Design an enzyme around this catalytic site. Structure first.
Site, PDB file in Angstrom:
ATOM      1  N   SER A 138       0.498  -1.331   0.038  1.00  0.00           N
ATOM      2  CA  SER A 138       0.142  -0.065  -0.088  1.00  0.00           C
ATOM      3  C   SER A 138       0.809   0.913   0.183  1.00  0.00           C
ATOM      4  O   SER A 138       1.976   1.096  -0.941  1.00  0.00           O
ATOM      5  CB  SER A 138      -1.344   0.071   1.268  1.00  0.00           C
ATOM      6  OG  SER A 138      -1.966   1.228   0.717  1.00  0.00           O
TER       7      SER A 138
ATOM      8  N   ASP B 113      -8.410  -3.284  -6.394  1.00  0.00           N
ATOM      9  CA  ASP B 113      -7.861  -2.541  -5.370  1.00  0.00           C
ATOM     10  C   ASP B 113      -8.564  -1.703  -5.059  1.00  0.00           C
ATOM     11  O   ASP B 113      -9.104  -0.237  -4.934  1.00  0.00           O
ATOM     12  CB  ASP B 113      -6.005  -1.887  -5.886  1.00  0.00           C
ATOM     13  CG  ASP B 113      -5.354  -1.350  -4.226  1.00  0.00           C
ATOM     14  OD1 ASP B 113      -4.888  -2.647  -3.845  1.00  0.00           O
ATOM     15  OD2 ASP B 113      -5.264  -0.692  -3.356  1.00  0.00           O
TER      16      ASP B 113
ATOM     17  N   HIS C  58      -7.106  -6.013  -1.271  1.00  0.00           N
ATOM     18  CA  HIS C  58      -6.228  -4.768  -0.552  1.00  0.00           C
ATOM     19  C   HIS C  58      -5.172  -5.017   0.133  1.00  0.00           C
ATOM     20  O   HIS C  58      -4.984  -5.424   1.365  1.00  0.00           O
ATOM     21  CB  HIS C  58      -6.577  -3.461   0.128  1.00  0.00           C
ATOM     22  CG  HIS C  58      -6.073  -2.438   0.609  1.00  0.00           C
ATOM     23  ND1 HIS C  58      -6.029  -2.606   2.036  1.00  0.00           N
ATOM     24  CD2 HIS C  58      -5.104  -1.535  -0.127  1.00  0.00           C
ATOM     25  CE1 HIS C  58      -4.358  -0.820   1.882  1.00  0.00           C
ATOM     26  NE2 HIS C  58      -4.038  -0.844   0.535  1.00  0.00           N
TER      27      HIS C  58
HETATM   28  C1  LIG Z   1      -4.139   3.908   0.867  1.00  0.00           C
HETATM   29  C2  LIG Z   1      -3.110   4.262   0.444  1.00  0.00           C
HETATM   30  O1  LIG Z   1      -1.953   4.336   0.944  1.00  0.00           O
HETATM   31  N1  LIG Z   1      -3.101   4.965  -0.683  1.00  0.00           N
HETATM   32  C3  LIG Z   1      -4.377   5.101  -1.207  1.00  0.00           C
HETATM   33  C4  LIG Z   1      -4.061   6.193  -2.617  1.00  0.00           C
HETATM   34  C5  LIG Z   1      -2.787   6.407  -2.521  1.00  0.00           C
HETATM   35  C6  LIG Z   1      -2.086   5.427  -1.247  1.00  0.00           C
HETATM   36  C7  LIG Z   1      -0.298   5.515  -1.685  1.00  0.00           C
HETATM   37  C8  LIG Z   1       0.411   5.994  -2.378  1.00  0.00           C
HETATM   38  C9  LIG Z   1      -0.148   6.674  -3.174  1.00  0.00           C
HETATM   39 CL1  LIG Z   1       0.416   7.923  -4.588  1.00  0.00          CL
HETATM   40  C10 LIG Z   1      -1.906   7.282  -3.351  1.00  0.00           C
HETATM   41 CL2  LIG Z   1      -2.577   7.829  -4.865  1.00  0.00          CL
END
Ligand SMILES: CC(=O)N1CCc2c1ccc(Cl)c2Cl
Ligand SMILES: *[C@@H]1O[C@H](CO)[C@@H](O)[C@H](O)[C@H]1NC(C)=O
Length: 351
Positions: free
Chosen positions: A147, A249, A295
């Site tokens: 994540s 996801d 996820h």
């Molecule tokens: C859950 C999480 O960690 N998220 C969801 C959206 C996201 C996360 C982590 C890095 C980036 Cl670039 C982006 Cl868009």
């Protein structure tokens, strides 16, 4: 078993959000020269207001004050071959996520700063202190993460490689395994700063966030947020990176404001999302992308169960290892589902 032992950073100026020392959990495997350094995920916070809320009810993601002395390695961090057919004999490192910055920050808590955002420095300091505990003799350092930790891999794998080169260890092969960290800066299904693009734009400024140098040079000042998106930053990376990403996801769907009888508009949105994700992986030679609504995967104990085209993720990662010694007979590394709806792959996690 509680087999990974907590070490707080000897350099106590590399800190979690609240100024407490960052740290790592270690279980050494003598004789193995493989090192697995895993970056925990857990969203992020991009202003004082939501960081204060996260500090009240998600404090372990912002502080080491209450961390236990040990953790059980699970999934790819397991030392049991039944749970971890891939790397059960490796040196195992779990790096807790306590910087709320997608592992991108390099700013200390200070006069102007209620919180420290030091994720990039935490990774650097863990690597530095591990060299004195056996990592100096490594042949492979796999920087993995799930994540926000998976996005952290994409942001940091080349910096670790450069760090080891400059420290005088050119023989350690640094590689990345990015799980569930490959996001699209797409249109929300319904408008709502949950939208992926705006959240990252605010974060960097608040965090002192740094991105890989080649990607920074493409997008330039004020546009470094682009480098948090896998399909944009991946082509600029030099280290080998294996990408694990559910086609649907759950965190992608959350920031897209999708909440699951599906009617035509949402069906088309979901099908377009899977097709877009699949497209972005077409030219990623080492990837595992099942058509599931789920996820993370890699530190779950049943990570062995999912298959794409008949190949498990532990097998695909072993095939990747062999490829890094032309494609291998019966040992594929590019595994992306083509079917267009969640759970059209029968091996998807049941929930
Ligand atoms: C859950 C999480 O960690 N998220 C969801 C959206 C996201 C996360 C982590 C890095 C980036 Cl670039 C982006 Cl868009
Ligand atoms: C401690 O970490 C900080 C943050 O990266 C760094 O500036 C400093 O040089 C480090 N000091 C030591 C003694 O490692």
């Amino acid at each position: 078993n509680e087999d990974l032992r907590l070490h707080l950073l000897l350099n106590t100026s590399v800190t979690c959000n609240d100024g407490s020392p960052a740290g790592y959990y270690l279980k050494e495997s003598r004789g193995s020269r493989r090192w697995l350094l895993f970056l925990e995920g857990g969203w992020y916070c991009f202003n004082r207001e939501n960081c204060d809320s996260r500090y009240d009810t998600m404090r372990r993601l912002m502080s080491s004050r209450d961390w236990p002395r040990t953790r059980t390695g699970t999934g790819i961090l397991s030392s049991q071959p039944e749970e971890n057919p891939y790397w059960w004999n490796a040196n195992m490192v779990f790096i807790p996520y306590c910087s709320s910055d997608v592992w991108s920050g390099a700013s200390s808590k200070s006069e102007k700063n209620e919180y420290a955002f030091m994720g990039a420095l935490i990774i650097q300091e863990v690597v530095r202190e591990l060299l004195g505990r056996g990592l100096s003799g490594a042949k492979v350092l796999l920087l993995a993460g799930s994540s926000a930790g998976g996005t952290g891999v994409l942001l940091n794998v080349d910096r670790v490689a450069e760090q080891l080169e400059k420290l005088g260890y050119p023989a350690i092969q640094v590689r990345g395994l990015a799980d569930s960290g490959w996001f699209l800066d797409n249109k929300q299904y319904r408008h709502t700063t949950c939208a992926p693009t705006e959240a990252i734009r605010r974060g960097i400024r608040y965090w002192n966030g740094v991105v890989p140098e080649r990607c920074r040079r493409q997008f330039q000042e004020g546009e470094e947020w682009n480098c948090f998106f896998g399909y944009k930053v991946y082509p600029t990376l030099r280290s080998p990176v294996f990408v694990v990403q559910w086609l649907f996801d759950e965190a992608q769907l959350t920031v897209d404001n999708v909440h699951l009888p599906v009617q035509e508009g949402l069906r088309l949105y979901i099908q377009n999302l899977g097709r877009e994700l699949r497209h972005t992986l077409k030219d990623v030679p080492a990837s595992f992308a099942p058509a599931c609504l789920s996820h993370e995967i890699i530190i779950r104990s049943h990570w062995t169960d999912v298959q794409v085209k008949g190949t498990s993720l532990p097998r695909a990662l072993h095939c990747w290892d062999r490829s890094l010694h032309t494609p291998l007979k019966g040992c594929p590394v590019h595994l992306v589902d083509s079917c267009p709806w969640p759970h059209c792959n029968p091996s998807c996690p049941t929930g």
